[PDB]
Design an enzyme around this catalytic site. Structure first.
Site, PDB file in Angstrom:
ATOM      1  N   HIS A 196       0.775  -1.248   0.000  1.00 36.17           N
ATOM      2  CA  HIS A 196       0.000   0.000   0.000  1.00 36.17           C
ATOM      3  C   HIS A 196       0.808   1.301   0.000  1.00 36.17           C
ATOM      4  O   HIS A 196       0.225   2.380  -0.111  1.00 36.17           O
ATOM      5  CB  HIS A 196      -0.960   0.019   1.193  1.00 36.17           C
ATOM      6  N   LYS A 241      -9.105  13.904   3.730  1.00 35.14           N
ATOM      7  CA  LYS A 241      -8.183  12.770   3.805  1.00 35.14           C
ATOM      8  C   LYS A 241      -7.366  12.955   5.081  1.00 35.14           C
ATOM      9  O   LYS A 241      -7.390  14.036   5.683  1.00 35.14           O
ATOM     10  CB  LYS A 241      -7.246  12.729   2.585  1.00 35.14           C
ATOM     11  N   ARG A 242      -6.643  11.924   5.496  1.00 32.81           N
ATOM     12  CA  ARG A 242      -5.798  12.043   6.693  1.00 32.81           C
ATOM     13  C   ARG A 242      -4.755  13.151   6.522  1.00 32.81           C
ATOM     14  O   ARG A 242      -4.291  13.408   5.406  1.00 32.81           O
ATOM     15  CB  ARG A 242      -5.123  10.708   7.018  1.00 32.81           C
ATOM     16  N   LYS A 280       0.655  14.395   1.564  1.00 31.53           N
ATOM     17  CA  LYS A 280      -0.621  14.739   0.930  1.00 31.53           C
ATOM     18  C   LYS A 280      -0.733  16.249   0.667  1.00 31.53           C
ATOM     19  O   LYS A 280      -1.606  16.693  -0.080  1.00 31.53           O
ATOM     20  CB  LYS A 280      -1.804  14.218   1.765  1.00 31.53           C
ATOM     21  N   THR A 292      -8.152   6.641  -2.976  1.00 30.79           N
ATOM     22  CA  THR A 292      -9.507   6.145  -3.276  1.00 30.79           C
ATOM     23  C   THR A 292     -10.531   7.264  -3.122  1.00 30.79           C
ATOM     24  O   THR A 292     -11.553   7.268  -3.801  1.00 30.79           O
ATOM     25  CB  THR A 292      -9.921   4.951  -2.407  1.00 30.79           C
ATOM     26  N   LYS A 296     -14.034   8.509  -5.387  1.00 32.07           N
ATOM     27  CA  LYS A 296     -15.306   8.881  -4.772  1.00 32.07           C
ATOM     28  C   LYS A 296     -15.813  10.211  -5.336  1.00 32.07           C
ATOM     29  O   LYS A 296     -16.989  10.319  -5.704  1.00 32.07           O
ATOM     30  CB  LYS A 296     -15.158   8.960  -3.240  1.00 32.07           C
TER      31      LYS A 296
END
Ligand SMILES: O=C(O)C[C@H](OC(=O)/C=C/c1ccc(O)cc1)[C@@H](OC(=O)/C=C/c1ccc(O)cc1)C(=O)O
Ligand SMILES: O=C(O)C[C@H](OC(=O)/C=C/c1ccc(O)cc1)[C@@H](OC(=O)/C=C/c1ccc(O)cc1)C(=O)O
Lengths: 810, 810
Positions: free
Chosen positions: A351, A542-543, A548, A650, A654
């Site tokens: 992952h 998101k986290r 990110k 992911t 969405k």
């Protein structure tokens, strides 16, 4: 009301109403005089559950008689969210229950909000496991999710003074009507002890025993009457544990702490003993259960014909040596045959490539906790390196690079290397990520065993992520092309013939606006915050992580603010910028990023000159149920990780399914999304993986960007001088220092192209018809990103089973 | 089958069978292919529970509308046992369910054995609370039992090598179908902190908060459709508790440990902080709940007209200062009015005179844990001693004797003194015990406030202790006099006219023999032990304590053995001597007594010369469900405590109702039993209280008895020399030393009269007809010892409410 929500017949509505009243009276011991809204939710939950269990028993009977190959999905995380609406959707019960509850004088949507999230995951990895269970049942596979029943899931996040505060997620407080305890399948798990060598092999003796008690939750497929099982283990002390008396009883908590709490780390390895105990606990109990079921179907040659074990990351990696332990020590198979069975049974999904996320357990930990498993790992390593030595003679450095044992200050076991050696298949989660695995971190392994390496691009379930959360959009789609797309998402391509259809364009834009109005109302009700529903909804959820790059988003927000202040009477497309996500409690920098966001909001949201042209909101307590609300209301999806860091994503998928446009880097599954939709229908910016590598070889110098971009310079000066923290001028000194001197993720390097690309977004939004046409082109090409497609590929190319869309009798 | 078990109609049996199948399928998710016997028990439990809940809701509605005076029974112990059969009995469902399960191919008695005991008590005190709840519901009183939901009740006892071993009683492992969680009534409880004094009185600040969550269990009256509530509190940590992160979550166990485990001490005070926290926790949550319910009916003058609080021993004594705290600090009532309300509300039941059982809490403990309650206690003490000083001027020693504060090495609070001062009624539990209270330990208090002191002789419920456990005996009684006696036990006197009835004599002796055969079979099945069912069943079952003198029993057993060895070919009435009961884990001497019993058994049971003329069995894991089995099979009840030590006893009453004769001292309720039945129908021996006092004043010298009784001498020599412990000759040196030099309970002083009295028992047993006639005279006079009589006296003379045998509509 709407078609995709099923039939509300006279017979069904009448039957639902009486079972609801039966449960309220007999199950909950209430009447309409004394019932609380929570009592009403439980009466409904129990009514819907009745429809599940009939199908549950006959699915397990079906599998028992047919005896198919069983798929075991091993994960430390299942990020399930709420269960009630999902169950109604998959059983075609939603309209019936809506009518039935209406006739009883109740609002079903209000009852739905009472259910607690099953928040047994951190982010992408755990939510993937949940989408997978849904697709496996919808595709009629005999699959079981195996994990841990955490008493406390991911923490509830509260924002106090702009700071994240954590509180315990006591999700089982009121009870879980969906689970069934199965104490008849309680199994012992061993820890510590020592290894004895006898005439007939090794024995693991003097161990501490902890019991594993399973709880089963039903997993319903979409309208096929298939209901699979998710089995979650709970830790229990044996009754003679430590058996002055009182203390011995109180010390039971020591054993039972194993299943107490989910480690709240997303993409970060923390080498704590309790975490290792969790990893072994789930693996040991599951493998015993798998073997029991196999025997109750001696001949282990056929074991891999009847069993597949999928390892979700390296977290359950101990399944490999545990299977060897059982086969060799208990079943008395010789090493080579045991190993053949193990390899053919196991497969591993990677992952992430981030070094700080990789599991490398100190040998001294495994030596004390799992002495026999260490011996097996050493023997696995010896035999593996002998094969490497034979394939690449004289290449001494390859041997040290491929070893499962890492030398240094402290010896460590590399769990990724263990997984590759002990699995017949290794896969990444998007095409670019899978290529990176073959080219960089697992290059040596790929050269030894090329056939082992695969790609399986991630997906999301269109049931939860379209029908459930965006009924309005699912309905206008079904009006044109029917309902079949819900379990065959490729059919969405048929929407391409409606791109010039003025009625359809109007309906798509209508659904979005309704979603935005409903979310704007939700914000005022639950959080007393005012926003303009006509502004562009700009969302990053998101986290919180440096990779990110929520910080890149922050720089853009400040740029817009400074531009408005400079030219106040100039027109700008109004935006509501929404950022949300949890920070791991020990992740200091992620916690500072949250504080920055709220601090920007404190200045922006109260400047009279700005007006309602720019609002910055931090979305508190981001979680599955909040995602189901905010995603359908989004216009713009922020997917802006540094190229090469986000394995797939992911959340991106969405947003694509729900009618938002994407601004993003060529990273993870963004590459395949842009390929499916066409690059012109996507807002791509920034460095490619190749540009990042070029910059690394040269040396990343953030100062260069600061010196050459006056707007960037102004922002850094605002941050340093205390513009966003008047009472604590040095508050954000860590952030500035990191940005200027040790930014692993090259925030400044993508700033210029990001701001420029954001201008192109604003320009398109000014033209509603052309915005909506581009949206239609995204929705229409999102079919590849259904987890039904992902699971079908796993089934055919890894597990060796054929999926089936055939109904079971009701 | 038998009449008292109710009707098995066509409509009822059909309905029960379909609901059973509904629960098996929908509730338990099983069919007849996969169901375990435990699944079958749960299907039945849920079927019977359905009949309870309808009556439950309308009972609570009834009380809400009528608004009667509510009775609150406060206890740290409720020794409930199993619930299934009890519920069937009280709902007249037993025969119907028996038929229904038979027709399904199941044995109901086998299913009944699967239910775990609710073992939330130690012995007499906790079982009294359980009998009381049953009688209060049968008598239509609006009563609530309030206690703690212990996760672990009284430990399961295992005998290993003759030694007691303890294991955790994990009674909730499989779930409790009878309880209902009520999280809407979750209440905060405060600990630690400090006291602030303001303009408007004191404030208790900086406290640690623990949540109390209630669980309700139904309490059904006998065939009157009344179902009362037992509310048990569970400890929960608040969600921000200690909120690195992981440890903060794991440390929740610290707060939740309050409700974890029952202190396994019977008639012994252990001054541990966790025990104090338990006592406050139940009191604080209950009183808040009582007040909430009172307000949801401002005017506290009427509080005692609507509320009675009964304190079961001093364990809930903190209710007195807690009620003052709430009324004074929170409701702002002046001291004197608050105190008037408190006294009129509270009443106290004393259960023992033994000094080691009295609660005397160190002031330093209360100072840290409950600083405000200490201040209130000091003020209660000051005002109380001012009244004593005015009534008895100049009597300085009375003042020190009556003070709630004890001076010395460590200052202590005498909780019994607190209870007397703060209650309008104080009662003992048998006539002799109540007199002892007025004459000795509470003499000063009785002289100040004579009106406060009452007697309420204990009782047992004839539902559990006759109908449920001895259906055979209840049936032959009902054949003669009808069924009315079950809720009016005095009617048993009508059996006196059948004492010469040859048919009845034959039936009584027949029922006993059947009971003895069934118990003899139970022993072989569950414990692989062989006994002669034609021998006299000689049984002593109760907690192991020095005062209860299991050791006296042991001396008799050894006497019989030595007599047989001396004259082997001489005839003796054969006996099976059964002794059972748990020892508190820290009670060394009680643990040695168990070991002695088994050691005697090891010698006696394997001597070929003895044969089946004498067997000594230790009954493992004595508890309510075992009592229901062994009591109906008993011929002889051993009630042999030193005169003045057993406040009442209740086991004695259980044996009397079930057709055993009693050998006992004039102690506790034995005095009233012998008075009811007539002394000639009882085997009385030993010192009276007066003889014990005479011996104390003189000085008890055990040596005198050893010197003058050759048979006693032989036994002591056997014990010392190692006759009963060959491999460890000095094993029982502690017992001998205690017997010879520091026996507080004068075992040797009653030996001669005990052995002689035992000979008279054997003589009567040789004449079956005359044994049975004496038995009939006991059963016929046991009516006074129904807890319906006890509760009616509490209601009229303490609580000020009238009982009602009137049905509620079904
Ligand atoms: O898949 C699950 O969710 C749990 C499994 O359930 C089943 O396999 C049930 C099979 C079944 C269900 C209903 C039937 O009428 C026949 C067989 C469970 O297996 C059983 O409980 C099997 C019970 C059983 C099967 C056959 C038999 O002869 C006795 C007991 C397990 O392995 O954990
Ligand atoms: O006695 C018990 O076992 C628990 C109490 O239950 C009741 O008093 C129930 C009363 C009732 C039950 C059913 C009805 O139709 C009306 C009133 C409970 O009280 C309630 O739950 C009351 C609920 C309620 C009563 C009246 C109303 O208007 C709203 C809610 C308590 O005090 O703990």
């Amino acid at each position: 009301q709407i078609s995709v929500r099923g039939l509300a017949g006279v017979e069904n509505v009448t039957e639902l109403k009486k079972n609801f009243n039966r449960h309220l009276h007999f199950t909950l011991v209430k009447d309409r005089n004394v019932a609380t809204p929570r009592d009403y939710y439980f009466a409904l939950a129990h009514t819907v559950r009745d429809h599940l269990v009939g199908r549950w028993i006959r699915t397990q009977q079906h599998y028992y008689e047919k005896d198919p190959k069983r798929i075991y999905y091993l994960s430390l995380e299942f990020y399930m969210g709420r269960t009630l609406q999902n169950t109604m959707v998959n059983l075609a019960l939603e309209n019936a229950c809506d009518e039935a509850t209406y006739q009883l004088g109740l609002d079903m949507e209000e009852l739905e909000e009472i259910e607690e999230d099953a928040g047994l995951g951190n982010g992408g990895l755990g939510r993937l496991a949940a989408c997978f269970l849904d697709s496996m049942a919808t595709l009629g596979l005999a699959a079981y999710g195996y994990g841990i029943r955490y008493e406390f899931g991911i923490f509830n996040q509260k924002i106090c003074g702009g700071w994240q505060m954590e509180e315990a997620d006591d999700w089982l407080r009121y009870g879980n009507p969906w689970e069934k305890a199965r104490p008849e399948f309680t199994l012992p798990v061993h820890f510590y002890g020592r290894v004895e060598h006898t005439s007939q092999g090794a024995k693991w003796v003097d161990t501490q025993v902890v019991l594993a008690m399973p709880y089963d939750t039903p997993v319903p497929g979409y309208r096929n009457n298939v209901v699979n099982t998710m089995r979650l283990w709970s830790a229990k002390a044996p009754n003679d544990f430590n058996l002055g008396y009182i203390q011995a009883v109180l010390d039971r908590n020591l054993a039972e702490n194993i299943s107490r709490v989910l480690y709240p780390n997303d993409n970060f390895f923390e080498g704590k003993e309790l975490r290792l105990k969790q990893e072994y606990f789930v693996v040991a109990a599951t493998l015993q259960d798998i073997i029991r079921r196999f025997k109750s179907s001696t001949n282990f040659d056929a074991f891999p014909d009847k069993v597949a074990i999928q390892l979700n990351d390296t977290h359950p990696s101990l399944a490999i040596p545990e299977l060897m332990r059982v086969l060799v020590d208990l079943e008395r198979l010789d090493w080579d045959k045991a190993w053949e069975v193990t390899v053919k049974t196991c497969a591993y999904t990677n992952h992430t490539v981030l070094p700080e996320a990789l599991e490398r357990w100190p040998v001294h930990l495994l030596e004390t906790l799992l002495p026999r498993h260490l011996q097996i790992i050493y023997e696995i390593n010896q035999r593996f390196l002998n094969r490497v030595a034979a394939a690449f003679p004289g290449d001494v450095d390859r041997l040290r690079r491929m070893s499962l044992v890492e030398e240094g200050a402290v010896k460590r076991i590399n769990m990724a290397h263990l997984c590759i050696a002990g699995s017949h298949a290794v896969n990444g989660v998007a095409r670019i990520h899978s290529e990176i695995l073959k080219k960089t971190i697992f290059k040596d392994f790929y050269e030894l065993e090329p056939h082992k390496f695969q790609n399986k691009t991630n997906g999301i379930t269109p049931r939860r992520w379209l029908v459930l959360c965006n009924p309005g959009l699912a309905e206008i789609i079904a009006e044109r092309i029917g309902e079949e797309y819900i379990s065959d998402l490729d059919q969405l391509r048929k929407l391409l013939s409606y791109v010039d259809d003025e009625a359809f364009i109007r309906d798509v834009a209508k659904v979005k606006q309704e979603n935005k109005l409903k979310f704007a109302a939700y914000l005022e009700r639950e959080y007393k915050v005012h926003i303009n529903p006509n502004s562009l909804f700009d969302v990053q959820v998101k986290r919180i992580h440096e990779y990110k790059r929520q910080l890149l988003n922050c720089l853009h927000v400040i740029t817009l603010y400074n531009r408005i202040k400079k030219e106040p009477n100039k027109f700008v497309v109004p935006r509501t910028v929404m950022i949300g996500g949890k920070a791991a409690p020990g992740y200091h920098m992620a916690k500072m990023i949250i504080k920055l966001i709220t601090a920007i909001g404190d200045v922006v949201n109260h400047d009279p000159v700005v007006g309602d042209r720019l609002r910055v909101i931090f979305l508190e307590n981001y979680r599955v149920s909040l995602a189901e609300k905010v995603i359908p209301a989004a216009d713009l999806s922020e997917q802006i990780s540094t190229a090469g860091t986000e394995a797939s994503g992911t959340g991106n998928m969405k947003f694509m399914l729900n009618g938002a446009l994407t601004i993003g880097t060529m990273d993870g599954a963004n590459v395949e999304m842009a390929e499916e939709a066409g690059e012109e229908n996507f807002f791509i910016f920034g460095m490619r993986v190749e540009d990042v590598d070029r910059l690394d070889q040269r040396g990343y110098n953030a100062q260069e960007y600061y010196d050459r971009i006056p707007e960037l310079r102004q922002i850094i000066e605002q941050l340093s001088s205390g513009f966003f923290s008047p009472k604590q001028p040095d508050l954000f000194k860590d952030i500035v220092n990191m940005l200027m001197h040790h930014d692993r993720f090259k925030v400044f390097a993508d700033y210029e192209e990001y701001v420029k690309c954001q201008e192109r977004v604003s320009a398109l939004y000014k033209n509603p018809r052309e915005w909506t046409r581009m949206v239609i082109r995204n929705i229409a090409t999102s079919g590849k990103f259904s987890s039904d497609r992902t699971i079908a590929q796993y089934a055919r190319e890894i597990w060796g089973v054929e999926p089936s869309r055939q109904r079971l009798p009701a």
